[PDB]
């Protein structure tokens, strides 16, 4: 349970740093670290299973980081074998809008991964609210 | 890859057999197909993830089936390994109303189920909408 | 284009027959016009496509008529190939109420049918408002 | 169901040229693609069923494309005869507003093909919410 | 200009005697009153134009004269040779409902008219608000 | 018969003459085409018979087209006699917004048409909704 | 004008025997009132002129009194020429409804009365709010 | 008769003339057809009877027309002798806003003629809507 | 002064009087006190001024009670002569409702009396809020 | 009753003296008409018994006169005695706004006069709504 | 401050006692704490400073104790001499409903106590929102 | 008494010196008249008790005046000792807003003083609604 | 640590029982475990802080439990030396209402731990939403 | 006592001047007295719990003071064990917006001290409403 433990560990690194990806609109390290084979159920998707990477490029381009800021909190990981985990944590968004306001994004999302020749690749991801 | 495909049948099935439990309120065979450390984002958790399976039982209390049909559209199933794999798709529902009249909801769903000692087992899941 | 103001008014005959099968809840003659693997979008349904013809089946129980008195305007139809055809009409639906009021209710439909083994057979249906 | 599978990639491609005429308002290319009796029921002509290609005309002015992406997710297809096809398809378009924001719109679509002069013409389209 | 003051009363004994049909539901006086060829535009057709006279029907069933009183206010003729005029007035609707409370109902009427063998038949009708 | 299509072809054009003169808020064409005791039963007379033609001038005055196209859609004819004639038809009026989204309006008009001297005159409009 | 003072006093009178009638529902003493031609635009006339007394039969049917109290404030009478008078007076209302609350309502009444061989007989009414 | 068809043609014309002085704030027009004893139910005065030309003065401040248009429907005219007379006739008004937009306002209006040393003169008016 | 502020005390007592009359409906004390000639301005007049002791009979018949407490606060009386006097005060009143809860009720007061022939008698009131 | 109907005439003009005080803002007048200790109820007082015309200094302070015409309607007058009396009325008040809008505002006052001296002074006023 | 902390107990005492008084509608001992010139501020007078005991004789009547408890949270006193103190509190009341739910009332009471002949007395209460 | 009556001015005139401070933002008389124990119930403390003569300090700083006028009504005075008093009476503000129109606020206050060292000073307040 | 990581859990047993005892209303176990002193914010206090247990002793009225579920999710405890500690959790509650709806009810939830002669018990608790 | 009233004080002094550290934004001062593992859950957090200081950060980014005044009311202190605290309080903001308003904000808020290594620092935080 100590190389378990360790390899939940690996999932949230991945995972965090597949979301600082994100932030920063990092598109080829999203690409390394998302499969081809990617299914995702997103608010950004209506209801649809949308399958791919295409897909998400769009929200890739233009002003970069807008001085937002993500947490992922308290993660939780499920171990399956040696090469298939899944995570689930919260989502926390703080950014300031149209004047300055401050506020606050919340979304629960869920991350299907998978140790394809050696390093971890998501296959499926599910994100709500 | 056809060892695949008849895998991704078995991922279906059981699945499917884990909504019809639902749909009956059959607590037996879903505690037979829902792990101990299944993890849950679900519209009833309000955001919140849960755990065990403690919770779920508070729905199954009561008069079984309202007569009320839902389908498992269009399954995407991944395969990782022979012990893990996960599946995405969309949960339809059609029940009726007070005044008799008909109705359709829907919900996207997640799945990640884990071969343990020969039987797949639901770990985590993520409803949404 | 007797050979096709013929066919037309044969088209048109075949969807009447359909029209009237759902009216009365008529399965039997339902399934006998509706392809096995026939595709569907409609408002039941979500804004998911439907195939095959157990999710209509749902609709087809309960008593039988009401005071319900369907009827397909102006159908449109444009006939394709060899076995091939399609038809657009607005399905007006004029019913009573618990109060006896009468009310009218429109859909625009179109449906999309194929001639096999000599007999004419609905393989894609999307209704829409 | 090479000759099938053929075809059904075949139809996708013309329907995927059909729509990238839209997206950048290619009336040319458009009414090479849609037939002279070519009928629609769709949001923009409320109820009505409409033919010919001149209403649609309206829509092709006013400079060209903007920040919108637009996609045909999982086309499900129908081969019938000689020349005719019909396919189904879940339509996204991702845009942006006035403040940069990023949104996605849906919709339900319906279209007939048929082969004239060995050419896929659009015959009839069902465009809905 | 005597026999045409006259001619429009004619219009309006005949479109009387048609309203005191339709009031008593006589579907006999209406249909010998109105042409099998009759268009019409009215509120129980959704914005969709009717065609004979079938379609009218479903309201010459039931309760017969429900305590209700209509009125045709000010008509207002036009003549068109010797055979054909319309005819446009107000039609004020008096009736109880629900608990017996008394309201007045009212429509905008159009009706053209046309001596086809002698007697005056209704060819088109259009009815508002 | 052809005497009689052909005739149905000159209410059409003229009709489509007239509708055409409001769009670019032409007088002179509205007036040579509508007769001096042309009643009128529309939206903007909110339920009220209107006499004469001092009353739609009101809307001829300024910036002629708003860049709006309108369609007339499968006129429906009726011949009574040789001098005498009506058409219903569904109007659609497609226009541009202020923040130049585009926007389709719906109405349902009817006509009468008296040939007064050689030339056809309106001399009784319906429009509603 | 005494004469005129006690003139004025009639057309209270009568208008009071009027009112009373209206208030038990005596429909024969209101029809020896009111002229046979009487004009009349109310609220339940929904802005429409009414001629007649058969529209106002509609309202004695049924229960007397009610329970209700209406009152006549300052009746203004004008004199005019001979045999000829109107008067304008706001007309109370105090009712019980449902629970036993008192309520009162509120109309100001314009009445025309014309001397027809001796009898005062209201030729003209105008009620309003 | 004839002699009574003039007299209300008379009144028509007083009556026209009375809202034109009104129309383009003519006063001494509108003192010389109104009696000093004019009483008068409308809206500007809240369910109060006014007394007096004085009260109306201030609708005739400056701003003449305003490029609104008033018209008279159908004037119903009843004749008490040769002195005495009350119009009755529903009034619109199209009226331009801002942003140019077109509109219409509704009332009922009616009006007592009382002629008075050879010359009629309004003792009476009730407006509503 | 002592005889002022004994006339005032006797302005005090009978206004007293009056106020536990309407309280359990005495109309004989009320129409004692109440003049004949008495004038009204009350919420239940609706913005009319009421004359007589008529209009307010309709509120002395019912229950005769209704467990609801009216109190006077700080009356001011002003002294006009050894005949007239006027008094102002708020009137507390306190109620019971349905689901015995106890309400209070305000309202602002103002009477003028008059030693008509030896006693005192109210020949105004206004009531308000 | 000649002298009875002269005090009446005195009452009105001096009330009309002070309401033409009130509105061209002359707090020298008003304090002339109004006694020292004159009691006040009315909107601006929220329900208050004011006391004293300290109060109403605080009105009398801006733009004297704001383009707006108030008009006492139907003026009732109460004689107590040769030196007291009492009067009630509604006062119409129409006024512009900023888009040169015409309104009419309304309330109903009382008021109690009183000889002192020889003078008419205001001791008591009571307006509401 | 030995004797401050003391007197400063007493008047809570005091306080308490007069609170619980009021719970179980002992009016006696309400009286008895309570000076018969007491000044009154509470929502019950909506805005009216009421003076005495009397005023509150209404809220004694009734159901003694409704199964309603009221908690007087950190009073703060104040010592003003020997004979004198005031004190300021939040009063907690928690009460049931029909359906049984549970609720918390709250609102901000202050009071000014008295010694009168060694006993201690309440000459004014406040009490808000 | 005489004595009594002399404390009850005293206090009129504190209190009243300190409302106009209150009013033109005087920061030094109202620490003058506020003793530093001095506890606060007010609108602006949401329920909150205050402490100190801090919490005020944030209304004191601003234009000094903002042209509202501030009536202390009827104040009661209890007098408790020659060291000690408190007293009640309704707050009026008149205040004119952005459009120069004039309003009125209205409050309840309670003041409660303190005779320390020869100076009154304000121990406790509290305000409503 | 492991000494440190099984106070945690001492810790999320004592507060489980505490809701057990809340969730059953056993309130002998709730007052051994929370300190008399014990403060609090909640709902049910309305942003006052409580003292004492008494406040609480009301919820624990009859009707034990309620078919309701509450849950503790991911307890985050504080150590603070051998005697003292916090802890956070976020609570569920699955309640059943009326119509057999099942819905859930969410707070966050802070207590504070004292450990005292051997025995944990709660000195404060925060909770909201 | 003293010792533990003065340790009362130390409480209340850190939980003041951490108070002040966020009013103006001070963040150094914010982190040398937060635990780098504190919890909080409040507002900014949706119901979600937080952990380290990390998240707070974005809040200290801009203009320091906003002219807003904060405070913090009648601090109630729980000493636990040694070296371990808890603090409840209200905390009231008072802000000045736009149009130059005054308004006050009031949240709950209870905060735990952990005296590790000598200097006080929260560990934990709640704030609500």
């Given at each position: 349970?100590?190389?378990?433990?360790?390899?939940?560990?690996?999932?949230?690194?991945?995972?965090?740093?597949?979301?600082?990806?994100?932030?920063?609109?990092?598109?080829?390290?999203?690409?390394?670290l998302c499969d081809t084979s990617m299914t995702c159920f997103e608010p950004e998707a209506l209801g649809n299973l949308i399958e791919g990477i295409e897909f998400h490029r769009?929200?890739?381009?233009?002003?970069?980081?807008?001085?937002?800021?993500?947490?992922?909190?308290?993660?939780?990981?499920?171990?399956?074998g040696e090469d298939a985990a899944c995570?689930?944590?919260?989502?926390?968004t703080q950014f300031l809008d149209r004047n300055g306001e401050a506020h606050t994004r919340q979304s629960?999302?869920?991350?299907?991964?998978?140790?394809?020749?050696?390093?971890w690749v998501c296959v499926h991801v599910h994100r709500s609210t």
């Open positions: 349970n100590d190389s378990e433990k360790a390899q939940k560990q690996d999932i949230v690194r991945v995972t965090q740093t597949l979301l600082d990806a994100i932030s920063c609109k990092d598109f080829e390290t999203y690409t390394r769009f929200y890739f381009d233009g002003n970069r980081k807008n001085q937002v800021h993500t947490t992922m909190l308290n993660p939780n990981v499920h171990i399956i995570v689930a944590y919260v989502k926390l629960q999302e869920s991350r299907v991964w998978s140790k394809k020749q050696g390093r």
